[PDB]
């Protein structure tokens, strides 16, 4: 059921209104750093890792050993990538 999302919308509307009231009452009285791109890429990768973790975590009781090892292989590939990034200095900000 999606019923529980309606209070969230009304909550958003009210929070927005509180924001406008608070902000509006006082009106009455060239140096590209590649390391930010690199940290964005790493965050993207591990964001997708968490994304894929969620269904796996709730499904462990049904997928049993096969699902566990398939996710382990997924993680092995991604962690080889992480080791590559670590060795190449992508994780060093000095």
């Amino acid at each position: 059921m999606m019923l529980e999302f309606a209070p969230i919308f009304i909550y958003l509307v009210i929070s927005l209104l509180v924001s406008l009231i608070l902000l509006g009452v006082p009106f009455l009285f060239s140096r590209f750093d590649i390391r930010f791109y690199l940290v964005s890429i790493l965050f993207l990768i591990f964001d997708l890792e968490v994304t894929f973790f969620f269904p796996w975590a709730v499904s462990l009781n049904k997928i049993d050993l096969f699902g566990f090892w398939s996710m382990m292989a997924f993680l092995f590939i991604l962690t080889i990538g992480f080791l590559y990034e670590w060795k190449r200095g992508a994780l060093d900000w000095e």
């Binding site: 690199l38 790493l42 990768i45 997924f74 590939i77 991604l78 990538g81 992480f82 190449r88 992508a90």
Partner: peptide
């Protein structure tokens, strides 16, 4: 798992092209 391979390619390419 093939999608994992795609992500690995993304990581490698990001490093090799910009580092």
């Amino acid at each position: 798992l093939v999608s994992s391979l795609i992500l690995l390619v993304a990581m490698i390419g990001a490093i090799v092209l910009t580092m």
